[PDB]
Coordinates of C-alpha atoms in Angstrom, one line a residue:
Chain N
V1 CA -0.2 0.2 0.0
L2 CA 1.8 3.0 -1.4
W3 CA -1.8 5.4 -1.5
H4 CA -4.3 5.7 0.8
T5 CA -7.3 7.5 0.8
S6 CA -10.7 7.7 2.5
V7 CA -13.7 9.4 0.6
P8 CA -17.6 10.0 1.6
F9 CA -20.4 7.7 0.2
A10 CA -22.5 8.9 -2.8
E11 CA -24.9 7.4 -5.1
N12 CA -22.7 8.8 -8.1
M13 CA -19.1 8.3 -5.9
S14 CA -15.8 7.6 -7.7
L15 CA -12.8 5.9 -6.2
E16 CA -10.0 7.8 -7.6
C17 CA -7.1 5.9 -9.5
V18 CA -4.6 7.7 -11.3
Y19 CA -1.5 6.2 -11.7
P20 CA 2.0 7.6 -11.6
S21 CA 4.2 7.0 -14.8
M22 CA 6.1 3.8 -13.5
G23 CA 7.8 1.3 -15.4
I24 CA 5.5 -0.7 -17.7
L25 CA 2.1 -1.4 -16.4
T26 CA 1.0 -4.8 -16.8
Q27 CA -2.5 -5.2 -15.3
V28 CA -4.7 -3.3 -13.0
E29 CA -7.3 -5.1 -10.8
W30 CA -10.2 -3.5 -8.4
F31 CA -11.2 -5.5 -5.0
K32 CA -13.7 -5.0 -2.6
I33 CA -11.8 -5.5 1.0
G34 CA -13.1 -7.7 3.2
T35 CA -11.7 -10.7 5.2
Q36 CA -12.1 -12.4 1.8
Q37 CA -11.6 -10.1 -1.7
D38 CA -14.3 -9.5 -3.8
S39 CA -13.2 -9.0 -7.3
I40 CA -14.5 -5.8 -9.3
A41 CA -13.0 -5.3 -12.4
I42 CA -9.6 -6.5 -14.1
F43 CA -7.8 -4.6 -16.5
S44 CA -5.5 -5.4 -19.5
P45 CA -3.6 -2.9 -21.5
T46 CA -4.1 -5.1 -24.5
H47 CA -7.2 -6.6 -24.2
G48 CA -9.2 -3.8 -22.3
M49 CA -11.8 -3.8 -19.4
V50 CA -13.5 -7.0 -17.8
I51 CA -15.8 -6.3 -15.1
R52 CA -17.1 -9.1 -12.8
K53 CA -20.7 -9.7 -13.4
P54 CA -22.1 -8.9 -9.8
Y55 CA -21.1 -5.5 -10.6
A56 CA -21.5 -5.5 -14.2
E57 CA -24.9 -3.0 -13.9
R58 CA -23.0 -1.1 -11.1
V59 CA -19.8 0.8 -12.2
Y60 CA -18.3 1.9 -15.2
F61 CA -14.9 3.6 -16.1
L62 CA -14.4 6.9 -18.4
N63 CA -13.1 6.6 -21.8
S64 CA -10.0 8.6 -21.0
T65 CA -6.9 8.7 -23.2
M66 CA -4.3 5.9 -22.3
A67 CA -1.7 8.5 -21.0
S68 CA -4.2 9.7 -18.5
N69 CA -3.5 6.9 -16.4
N70 CA -6.9 6.8 -15.3
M71 CA -8.2 3.4 -13.5
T72 CA -11.5 5.4 -11.7
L73 CA -14.1 3.3 -10.4
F74 CA -17.5 5.6 -11.0
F75 CA -20.8 4.1 -9.4
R76 CA -24.1 3.8 -11.1
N77 CA -26.5 4.0 -7.9
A78 CA -24.4 3.0 -5.2
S79 CA -25.9 1.5 -2.1
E80 CA -25.3 0.8 1.9
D81 CA -23.3 -2.4 0.9
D82 CA -20.8 0.0 -1.2
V83 CA -19.5 1.4 1.8
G84 CA -16.1 -0.1 3.2
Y85 CA -12.1 -0.5 1.8
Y86 CA -11.1 -1.0 -1.9
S87 CA -8.1 -1.8 -3.4
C88 CA -7.1 -0.5 -6.8
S89 CA -4.3 -2.8 -7.6
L90 CA -1.1 -1.7 -10.1
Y91 CA 0.9 -4.6 -11.6
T92 CA 4.0 -2.9 -13.5
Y93 CA 7.0 -4.3 -14.7
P94 CA 10.0 -4.1 -13.3
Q95 CA 9.1 -2.4 -10.1
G96 CA 6.3 -4.6 -9.0
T97 CA 2.9 -4.4 -7.4
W98 CA 1.9 -1.6 -5.6
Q99 CA -2.0 -1.0 -4.3
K100 CA -4.0 2.3 -3.3
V101 CA -6.5 1.4 -1.1
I102 CA -9.6 3.9 -0.7
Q103 CA -12.3 4.0 2.1
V104 CA -15.8 4.7 1.7
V105 CA -17.3 6.0 4.8
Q106 CA -20.3 7.4 5.7
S107 CA -19.8 11.3 6.2
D108 CA -20.3 14.7 5.3
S109 CA -17.3 17.3 4.3
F110 CA -14.2 16.4 6.2
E111 CA -13.3 19.7 7.3
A112 CA -16.6 19.8 9.3
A113 CA -15.8 17.0 11.7
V114 CA -12.0 19.1 12.2
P115 CA -11.6 22.7 13.9
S116 CA -8.3 23.8 13.4
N117 CA -5.9 24.1 16.2
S118 CA -3.1 26.0 14.8
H119 CA -2.6 28.5 11.6
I120 CA 0.6 28.6 9.8
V121 CA 1.0 31.0 6.1
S122 CA 3.8 30.0 3.9
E123 CA 5.0 30.7 0.5
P124 CA 5.0 28.6 -2.6
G125 CA 8.8 27.1 -2.7
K126 CA 9.3 26.6 0.7
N127 CA 9.4 23.7 2.7
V128 CA 6.5 23.5 5.5
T129 CA 7.5 21.5 8.9
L130 CA 4.9 20.4 10.9
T131 CA 4.8 19.0 14.3
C132 CA 2.2 17.1 16.2
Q133 CA 1.6 17.8 20.1
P134 CA 3.0 14.8 22.3
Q135 CA 1.3 15.3 25.8
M136 CA 1.1 12.6 28.3
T137 CA 2.8 9.8 29.8
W138 CA 0.2 7.5 28.3
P139 CA 2.5 5.7 25.8
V140 CA 1.5 6.4 22.4
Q141 CA 0.8 3.5 20.4
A142 CA 0.1 4.7 17.2
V143 CA 0.5 8.0 15.3
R144 CA -0.7 9.0 11.8
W145 CA -0.7 12.3 9.7
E146 CA -3.9 12.8 7.0
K147 CA -4.5 15.7 4.9
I148 CA -7.7 17.1 5.0
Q149 CA -9.9 18.1 2.3
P150 CA -13.8 18.4 2.1
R151 CA -14.5 15.6 0.1
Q152 CA -11.2 13.4 0.6
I153 CA -8.6 12.3 3.2
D154 CA -4.8 11.2 2.2
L155 CA -3.3 9.3 4.8
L156 CA 0.3 10.7 4.2
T157 CA 1.6 8.3 7.1
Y158 CA 1.1 6.2 10.5
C159 CA 3.9 4.8 12.7
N160 CA 2.8 1.8 14.9
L161 CA 4.9 2.2 17.9
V162 CA 4.0 -1.0 19.5
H163 CA 2.7 -3.6 17.0
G164 CA 2.3 -3.6 13.5
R165 CA 3.8 -2.4 10.1
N166 CA 4.1 1.0 9.3
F167 CA 2.9 3.1 6.4
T168 CA 4.7 6.1 4.3
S169 CA 2.6 7.6 1.7
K170 CA 3.8 7.9 -1.9
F171 CA 1.5 9.7 -4.2
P172 CA 0.6 12.1 -5.0
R173 CA 3.7 14.2 -3.6
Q174 CA 6.6 13.5 -1.0
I175 CA 5.9 13.3 2.5
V176 CA 9.2 13.0 4.5
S177 CA 8.4 10.8 7.6
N178 CA 10.8 8.7 9.5
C179 CA 8.9 7.3 12.5
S180 CA 11.7 5.8 14.5
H181 CA 13.3 7.6 17.9
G182 CA 10.5 10.0 19.1
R183 CA 10.6 12.0 15.8
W184 CA 7.1 10.4 14.6
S185 CA 6.2 13.7 15.9
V186 CA 7.2 15.6 12.6
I187 CA 6.8 15.2 9.1
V188 CA 8.1 17.9 6.3
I189 CA 6.4 19.1 3.1
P190 CA 9.1 19.9 0.4
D191 CA 8.6 23.1 -1.6
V192 CA 4.6 23.6 -1.3
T193 CA 2.6 24.7 -4.0
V194 CA -1.0 26.5 -3.5
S195 CA -2.6 23.0 -3.9
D196 CA -0.7 21.8 -0.4
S197 CA -3.0 24.5 1.1
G198 CA -5.5 22.5 3.7
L199 CA -5.7 20.9 7.2
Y200 CA -3.0 18.8 8.5
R201 CA -3.8 16.5 11.2
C202 CA -1.9 14.4 13.7
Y203 CA -3.5 11.9 15.9
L204 CA -2.3 10.0 19.0
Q205 CA -3.5 6.6 19.9
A206 CA -2.2 5.9 23.4
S207 CA -2.5 3.4 25.8
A208 CA -5.0 4.1 28.6
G209 CA -5.7 7.9 27.6
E210 CA -6.0 7.3 24.0
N211 CA -7.2 9.3 21.4
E212 CA -5.8 13.0 21.4
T213 CA -5.1 14.9 18.1
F214 CA -3.7 18.5 16.4
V215 CA -4.9 20.1 13.4
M216 CA -3.2 22.4 11.5
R217 CA -4.1 24.7 8.4
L218 CA -1.5 25.5 5.7
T219 CA -1.8 28.6 3.3
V220 CA 0.1 29.2 0.9
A221 CA 0.6 32.3 -0.9
Chain L
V1 CA -3.3 -21.5 24.3
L2 CA -4.0 -19.7 27.5
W3 CA -5.8 -16.5 28.3
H4 CA -4.1 -12.6 27.7
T5 CA -6.8 -10.9 30.2
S6 CA -8.2 -12.4 33.3
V7 CA -11.1 -10.4 34.9
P8 CA -13.5 -11.3 38.0
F9 CA -16.9 -11.7 37.2
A10 CA -19.7 -9.0 37.7
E11 CA -23.0 -8.2 36.4
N12 CA -21.6 -5.1 34.7
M13 CA -18.0 -6.6 34.2
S14 CA -16.3 -5.2 30.8
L15 CA -13.8 -7.0 28.1
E16 CA -11.4 -4.7 27.2
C17 CA -10.2 -5.6 23.7
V18 CA -8.1 -2.9 22.4
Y19 CA -6.7 -3.5 19.2
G20 CA -3.9 -0.3 10.0
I21 CA -7.4 -1.5 8.2
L22 CA -9.7 -3.2 9.9
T23 CA -11.7 -6.2 7.8
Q24 CA -13.3 -8.0 10.7
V25 CA -13.8 -8.4 14.3
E26 CA -15.5 -11.1 16.4
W27 CA -16.6 -12.1 19.8
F28 CA -16.9 -15.5 20.7
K29 CA -17.4 -17.4 23.6
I30 CA -14.9 -20.8 24.0
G31 CA -16.2 -23.6 26.3
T32 CA -16.8 -27.2 24.8
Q33 CA -17.7 -25.4 21.5
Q34 CA -17.3 -21.8 20.3
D35 CA -20.6 -19.5 20.2
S36 CA -20.5 -15.9 18.4
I37 CA -21.4 -13.2 20.4
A38 CA -20.8 -10.0 17.8
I39 CA -19.5 -9.6 14.8
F40 CA -18.5 -6.4 13.1
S41 CA -17.4 -5.2 9.5
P42 CA -17.0 -1.7 7.9
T43 CA -19.7 -2.5 5.5
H44 CA -22.3 -3.9 7.9
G45 CA -21.7 -2.5 11.0
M46 CA -22.2 -4.3 14.6
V47 CA -24.6 -7.0 14.6
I48 CA -25.2 -8.7 17.9
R49 CA -26.2 -12.2 17.7
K50 CA -29.4 -12.9 19.1
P51 CA -28.3 -15.2 22.6
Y52 CA -26.4 -12.1 23.7
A53 CA -28.7 -9.4 22.4
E54 CA -30.2 -8.6 25.9
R55 CA -26.7 -9.4 27.7
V56 CA -24.0 -7.0 26.0
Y57 CA -23.6 -3.6 24.5
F58 CA -20.5 -1.9 22.9
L59 CA -19.7 2.0 23.0
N60 CA -18.7 2.4 19.5
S61 CA -16.3 5.3 19.9
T62 CA -13.5 6.3 17.8
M63 CA -13.0 2.8 15.7
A64 CA -9.7 3.9 14.5
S65 CA -8.6 4.0 18.0
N66 CA -9.1 0.4 17.7
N67 CA -11.7 -0.3 20.6
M68 CA -14.0 -3.3 20.7
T69 CA -14.8 -3.6 24.4
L70 CA -17.3 -6.1 25.3
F71 CA -19.7 -4.9 27.8
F72 CA -22.0 -6.6 30.1
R73 CA -25.0 -4.6 31.6
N74 CA -26.3 -7.7 33.0
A75 CA -24.3 -11.1 33.3
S76 CA -25.5 -14.2 34.9
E77 CA -23.3 -17.4 36.2
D78 CA -23.0 -19.0 32.8
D79 CA -20.9 -15.6 31.5
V80 CA -18.0 -17.3 33.5
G81 CA -15.6 -18.7 31.2
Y82 CA -13.6 -17.9 28.3
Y83 CA -13.8 -15.4 25.5
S84 CA -11.9 -14.5 22.1
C85 CA -12.0 -11.1 20.7
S86 CA -11.2 -12.1 17.4
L87 CA -9.7 -9.4 14.7
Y88 CA -9.0 -9.3 10.7
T89 CA -6.7 -6.9 9.4
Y90 CA -5.7 -6.2 5.8
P91 CA -4.0 -8.1 4.6
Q92 CA -2.4 -9.3 7.2
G93 CA -4.6 -11.8 8.9
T94 CA -5.7 -12.7 12.2
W95 CA -5.1 -10.9 15.7
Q96 CA -6.4 -12.3 18.7
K97 CA -7.1 -12.2 22.3
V98 CA -8.7 -14.3 24.7
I99 CA -9.8 -13.0 27.8
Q100 CA -10.8 -15.2 31.1
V101 CA -13.8 -14.5 33.4
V102 CA -13.3 -15.8 36.7
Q103 CA -16.2 -16.8 39.0
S104 CA -14.4 -17.1 42.4
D105 CA -13.8 -13.1 42.1
Chain D
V1 CA -1.4 -16.4 6.3
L2 CA -0.1 -20.3 6.4
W3 CA 1.7 -22.0 4.1
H4 CA 1.2 -24.4 0.8
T5 CA 4.5 -26.6 0.7
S6 CA 7.1 -26.8 3.3
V7 CA 10.9 -28.5 2.0
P8 CA 14.0 -28.9 4.2
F9 CA 16.8 -27.3 3.8
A10 CA 19.4 -27.9 0.8
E11 CA 21.8 -25.4 -0.9
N12 CA 20.7 -26.8 -4.3
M13 CA 17.1 -26.7 -3.1
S14 CA 14.3 -26.0 -5.6
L15 CA 11.1 -24.5 -4.3
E16 CA 8.5 -25.6 -6.7
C17 CA 6.1 -23.0 -8.1
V18 CA 4.2 -25.0 -10.9
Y19 CA 1.6 -23.5 -11.9
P20 CA -1.9 -24.4 -13.6
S21 CA -2.3 -23.1 -17.2
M22 CA -5.0 -20.3 -16.9
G23 CA -5.8 -17.8 -19.2
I24 CA -2.7 -15.3 -20.0
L25 CA 0.2 -15.0 -17.8
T26 CA 0.9 -11.6 -17.5
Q27 CA 3.6 -11.5 -14.6
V28 CA 5.0 -13.4 -12.4
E29 CA 7.1 -12.3 -9.0
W30 CA 9.1 -14.0 -6.0
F31 CA 8.8 -12.3 -2.5
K32 CA 10.5 -13.4 0.7
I33 CA 8.0 -12.5 3.4
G34 CA 9.7 -12.3 6.6
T35 CA 8.4 -9.1 8.9
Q36 CA 8.5 -7.5 5.7
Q37 CA 7.7 -8.1 1.9
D38 CA 11.4 -8.4 0.2
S39 CA 11.3 -8.8 -3.5
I40 CA 13.5 -11.9 -5.0
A41 CA 12.7 -11.8 -8.7
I42 CA 10.1 -10.5 -11.5
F43 CA 9.4 -12.4 -14.8
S44 CA 7.6 -10.3 -17.7
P45 CA 6.4 -12.9 -20.7
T46 CA 8.1 -10.4 -23.1
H47 CA 10.8 -9.0 -21.1
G48 CA 12.0 -11.9 -19.2
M49 CA 13.7 -12.2 -15.8
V50 CA 15.0 -9.7 -13.5
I51 CA 16.7 -11.0 -10.1
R52 CA 17.0 -8.2 -7.5
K53 CA 20.6 -7.7 -6.6
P54 CA 20.0 -8.9 -2.8
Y55 CA 19.4 -12.7 -4.3
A56 CA 21.6 -12.4 -7.8
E57 CA 24.0 -14.8 -6.3
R58 CA 21.8 -16.9 -4.1
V59 CA 19.1 -18.3 -7.0
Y60 CA 18.5 -18.8 -10.8
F61 CA 15.6 -20.2 -12.9
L62 CA 15.3 -22.2 -16.0
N63 CA 15.4 -20.9 -19.2
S64 CA 13.8 -24.0 -21.2
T65 CA 10.3 -24.9 -21.2
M66 CA 8.4 -22.3 -19.1
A67 CA 5.4 -22.8 -21.2
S68 CA 5.2 -26.0 -19.0
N69 CA 4.2 -23.7 -16.3
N70 CA 7.1 -23.4 -14.2
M71 CA 8.5 -20.7 -12.2
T72 CA 10.6 -22.6 -9.5
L73 CA 13.1 -21.0 -7.6
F74 CA 16.5 -22.9 -7.9
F75 CA 19.1 -22.3 -5.3
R76 CA 22.6 -22.1 -6.6
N77 CA 23.8 -21.5 -3.0
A78 CA 22.1 -20.8 0.1
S79 CA 22.3 -19.7 3.9
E80 CA 20.6 -19.7 7.3
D81 CA 19.0 -16.7 5.8
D82 CA 17.3 -18.3 3.0
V83 CA 15.1 -20.1 5.4
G84 CA 11.5 -19.1 6.2
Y85 CA 8.9 -18.1 3.8
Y86 CA 8.6 -17.1 0.1
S87 CA 5.6 -16.3 -2.2
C88 CA 5.4 -17.5 -5.5
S89 CA 2.7 -15.0 -7.1
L90 CA 1.3 -15.4 -10.4
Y91 CA -0.6 -12.6 -12.3
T92 CA -3.4 -13.8 -15.3
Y93 CA -5.8 -12.1 -17.2
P94 CA -8.7 -12.4 -16.6
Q95 CA -8.6 -14.7 -13.6
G96 CA -6.6 -12.5 -11.3
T97 CA -3.7 -13.7 -9.0
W98 CA -2.7 -16.9 -8.0
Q99 CA -0.5 -17.3 -4.9
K100 CA 1.8 -20.3 -3.8
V101 CA 3.4 -19.9 -0.1
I102 CA 6.5 -22.4 0.3
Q103 CA 7.7 -22.8 3.7
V104 CA 11.8 -23.8 4.2
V105 CA 12.6 -25.5 7.3
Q106 CA 15.8 -25.2 9.2
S107 CA 16.8 -27.7 11.8
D108 CA 16.8 -30.8 9.8
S109 CA 13.0 -31.6 10.7
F110 CA 11.0 -33.6 8.6
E111 CA 8.8 -36.6 8.0
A112 CA 11.2 -38.3 10.3
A113 CA 9.1 -37.6 13.2
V114 CA 5.9 -38.9 11.6
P115 CA 4.7 -42.1 12.6
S116 CA 1.3 -43.5 11.6
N117 CA -2.1 -43.7 13.6
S118 CA -3.8 -45.3 11.1
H119 CA -3.0 -47.5 8.2
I120 CA -5.0 -48.2 4.8
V121 CA -4.5 -50.2 1.7
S122 CA -6.1 -49.8 -1.3
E123 CA -6.0 -51.2 -4.9
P124 CA -5.2 -48.5 -7.8
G125 CA -8.5 -47.1 -9.3
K126 CA -10.4 -46.9 -6.2
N127 CA -12.1 -43.9 -4.8
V128 CA -10.3 -43.4 -1.3
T129 CA -12.0 -41.8 1.7
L130 CA -9.8 -40.6 4.3
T131 CA -11.2 -38.9 7.5
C132 CA -10.1 -36.8 10.9
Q133 CA -10.3 -37.9 14.1
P134 CA -12.4 -34.9 16.0
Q135 CA -12.4 -35.4 19.9
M136 CA -14.9 -32.5 20.2
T137 CA -13.5 -31.2 23.2
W138 CA -12.4 -28.0 21.5
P139 CA -14.3 -25.9 18.8
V140 CA -11.9 -26.6 15.9
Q141 CA -10.7 -23.0 14.6
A142 CA -9.3 -24.5 11.3
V143 CA -8.6 -28.0 9.5
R144 CA -5.5 -28.5 7.6
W145 CA -5.0 -31.6 5.1
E146 CA -1.6 -32.5 4.3
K147 CA 0.6 -34.8 2.3
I148 CA 4.0 -35.8 3.9
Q149 CA 6.5 -36.7 1.5
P150 CA 10.4 -37.0 1.8
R151 CA 11.1 -34.0 0.3
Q152 CA 8.2 -32.0 0.8
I153 CA 4.7 -31.7 2.8
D154 CA 2.0 -30.0 0.5
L155 CA -1.4 -28.7 1.6
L156 CA -4.0 -30.6 -0.2
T157 CA -7.0 -28.7 1.6
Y158 CA -7.5 -25.9 4.2
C159 CA -10.9 -25.2 6.0
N160 CA -11.5 -22.0 8.3
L161 CA -14.4 -22.6 10.4
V162 CA -14.3 -19.0 12.0
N163 CA -9.9 -18.8 3.1
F164 CA -6.8 -20.6 1.4
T165 CA -7.1 -22.7 -1.9
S166 CA -4.6 -25.8 -2.4
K167 CA -2.3 -25.1 -4.9
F168 CA -1.4 -29.1 -5.0
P169 CA -2.0 -31.0 -8.3
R170 CA -3.9 -34.1 -7.3
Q171 CA -7.8 -32.7 -7.6
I172 CA -8.7 -33.9 -3.6
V173 CA -12.4 -33.7 -3.4
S174 CA -13.4 -31.7 -0.3
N175 CA -16.0 -29.6 0.7
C176 CA -15.9 -28.3 4.4
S177 CA -19.8 -27.5 4.0
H178 CA -21.5 -28.7 7.3
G179 CA -18.9 -30.7 9.0
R180 CA -17.5 -32.3 5.6
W181 CA -14.1 -30.8 7.0
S182 CA -13.4 -34.1 8.6
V183 CA -12.7 -35.7 5.4
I184 CA -11.5 -35.7 2.1
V185 CA -11.9 -38.3 -1.3
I186 CA -8.9 -39.3 -3.0
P187 CA -10.7 -40.3 -6.8
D188 CA -9.1 -42.6 -9.0
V189 CA -6.2 -43.6 -6.5
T190 CA -2.5 -44.6 -8.0
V191 CA 0.7 -46.1 -6.7
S192 CA 1.8 -42.2 -6.5
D193 CA -0.4 -41.4 -3.9
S194 CA 1.4 -44.2 -1.7
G195 CA 2.5 -42.0 1.5
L196 CA 1.5 -40.3 4.9
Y197 CA -1.8 -37.8 5.2
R198 CA -2.2 -35.7 8.0
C199 CA -5.5 -34.0 9.0
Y200 CA -4.5 -31.1 11.4
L201 CA -6.9 -29.5 13.8
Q202 CA -6.2 -26.0 15.2
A203 CA -8.4 -25.0 18.6
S204 CA -9.8 -21.5 19.2
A205 CA -7.9 -21.3 22.3
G206 CA -6.6 -24.6 23.2
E207 CA -4.2 -27.2 21.9
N208 CA -4.1 -28.6 18.1
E209 CA -4.8 -32.8 17.5
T210 CA -2.9 -34.4 15.0
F211 CA -4.0 -37.5 13.1
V212 CA -1.6 -39.3 10.5
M213 CA -2.6 -42.0 8.4
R214 CA -0.5 -44.0 5.7
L215 CA -1.9 -44.9 2.7
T216 CA -0.4 -48.0 0.6
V217 CA -1.6 -48.2 -2.8
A218 CA -1.6 -51.9 -4.8

């Protein structure tokens, strides 16, 4: 998993999956994630797209140009059973397999759930350093950084400090994240553009006193 | 296999279960057989099985905090025994916490 | 995730990944699954094989008939660190992904410690039914049917009773629909089917049962 987003449920929701040119694309496959993966569609760069029968009347794709790299999944009339986790799996040569995970949640604008704890104004071209606000004697089990927009959360990184594997987002842009050594608290956004404006959230999952967070608004001139 | 957490019996006892991408959570009672208590999925939500419907509840707080603690609002002598808090993550798989409920307090 | 095949150590060990013919083969990739997914080699049916630098000296593959459905990972040389778990992933169109997990065991431990609890004799051409010996004292979490050979142990059937499909090319008839997990049928048995078979029962919160049976075909 190199890319993890969350989007609100809608009857006409589209699950964005645009792959960066990286080597040769050899196959794409869409899955509904559960304990067992449910295949939605499979794409050949030679023979085209096959939608699995349970989804034949429920999803479609755009007739976008080849160099658009667009595998975005579109729902006709989505229903409550289409809530959950999705996988857009990219198979490339010689780099290998990578996966984008998209979670469909029941939700309003993701900005509405978060009031900013902080505001920073920067200019394009500068690196922007963001920090968590570690507090307690309570051990931090997990740390996660997200970029928040009204229609989309981009999971930038998470560090499991007690158990599990870590995650660092590649795509769409570079996130400087390390996790090791009590510097899970800091990330850098190198060379910001206006499109980097938005809300940035650090969530701290602790042991007994779990669940604390810090939001900061970035505004690029 | 033995237990991870051991608690004494109480009518209002709560069985703590704390803890990526969670695809399924299920509570079982382990005796001579395995009885399902409640099952959760991100698509269907939390669905409690009928034999425990009047016994247990969940305070569905932040699920991203990884908390599925089983609350007894009423508990009887037969709620003593072994419990399993079973967890499936994507694509890693299993994570299981076994909990013992002791009658002697 | 558990394994499909298990083999003992050897510096010339061959981790068999014979796959079925199913649609168009579009890509193959070998990983070593440790605490992290580590890439060994990647194959394109047009561009050929790339072996990642950490395994360039270690491993090699046949350049012969690959159309025989063969991507077996041959070791040229091997150390303690080549012990562990491997993933042989086949990518096909339109069927999708086909994955075989392969276990390499260290201590010089293998079928030498496997005595039978039961012995069945059958003539070739017969449909042989094998059965577990469930004791009905722990709920059965999961069922594994395995074939124990001198050079490899293969998974025949897996059933989680809360998914994992066999990659063994024998066509074992099994269902695990409603208690069916306790039996498997070997149809039209041959002399090559002789050997040790094991039913493995995983308990939810207890100890695991083992029933080993020897089948000898006339």
